[PDB]
Design a protein around this ligand. Structure first.
Ligand code: DZ9
Ligand code: CA
Ligand code: CA
Ligand code: CA
Lengths: 189, 189
């Protein structure tokens, strides 16, 4: 009966956009906590740069360390290459039979839910939480919860480009993440 | 091989945002045509409304009628249930052996490509075209083509809330589609 949120992604890098979404859902739905679920990234086909699991995990640590109700879930990182959400949620529900998982997704992704691997069985494992801007209404045959979220146009691709151009990203992600990015020379070609 | 774009989605309703994306990719990559690929929607779990196949197809016709280089592909819509993209593209590849398919996806979708059903096999059937805001880049282990398109922010979920509130959506989607929506009482739920 414990209400726990799940927010998945590569977190490459983690930013205030992610934290804002996790916080809003935590508060809207009265969750006990939100788990950040870092995805595996397959090796690059052409051997080009991917952000190491080590780096993504430490940025997540730094991003969430000051937040009481945010935790990191290592389930997806703990085996294989990438996992279907079904596979991950199967293991978490078996592992935490007392938890009601609330799986947070962007509004734009809602229309594509019928294409998710093994969707019908996943619907028995999680409650989906669709996030949408004020003024936006989500539509789906599936029983999802909608949460309205403020606009802050920060994205990982934005931040990556700023670091490439040796610009600062003050005010866009936690200070400690920024220091890590700068010290490890991340995202600079 | 003929270069053909694929833009998939529920188009519920189709609007200027979709046409802008298709058109930009069409011009950027010198495609012969862009085929809009309407998805199937499973029946509502709680007996509520989904927009019919008939309605979605006719809005799509009205949205694309003026453009020679825009067509509608019925591969998914003619089926009884939803299709994985891999299964659709395998059939299309089979049916059109001289076509190189360019599969258009939103920038936000790129991060989650490793979770798509049969992604490795699908990579051998299509070239993905990711849409980035101008000056921004997409990060993925997969070989993808990037097309820059401004984020125009018009969305189906905005238009639907507007129709529920009994507003017009003039200047946000083709005139003909707005008429069809109003005349048929779509999006009032
Ligand atoms: N299979 C998935 C998606 C998908 O099929 N998208 C899509 C996008 C454009 C056209 C299309 F046919 C499908 S979006 C998505 N998001 C996720 C997420 C994982 C964690 C947060 S969202 C997992 C799987 C998929
Ligand atoms: Ca730097
Ligand atoms: Ca009406
Ligand atoms: Ca009515």
């Amino acid at each position: 009966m414990r209400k726990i949120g799940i927010i998945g992604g590569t977190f490459d890098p983690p930013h205030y956009g992610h934290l804002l979404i996790a916080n809003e859902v935590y508060h809207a739905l009265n969750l006990e906590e939100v788990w950040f679920l870092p995805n595996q990234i397959p090796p690059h086909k052409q051997g080009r740069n991917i952000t190491s699991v080590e780096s993504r995990l430490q940025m997540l640590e730094l991003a969430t360390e000051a937040e009481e109700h945010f935790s990191i879930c290592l389930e997806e990182l703990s085996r294989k290459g990438p996992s279907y959400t079904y596979d991950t949620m199967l293991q978490l529900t078996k592992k935490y039979p007392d938890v009601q998982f609330h799986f947070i997704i962007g509004g734009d992704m809602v229309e594509y839910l019928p294409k998710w691997y093994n969707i019908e069985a996943l619907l028995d494992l999680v409650t989906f939480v669709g996030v949408a801007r004020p003024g936006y209404k989500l539509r789906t045959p599936y029983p999802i919860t909608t949460v309205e979220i403020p606009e802050f146009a920060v994205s990982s691709s934005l931040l990556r480009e700023r670091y490439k151009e040796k610009k600062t990203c003050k005010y866009l992600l936690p200070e400690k993440v920024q220091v890590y990015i700068e010290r490890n020379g991340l995202y600079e070609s």
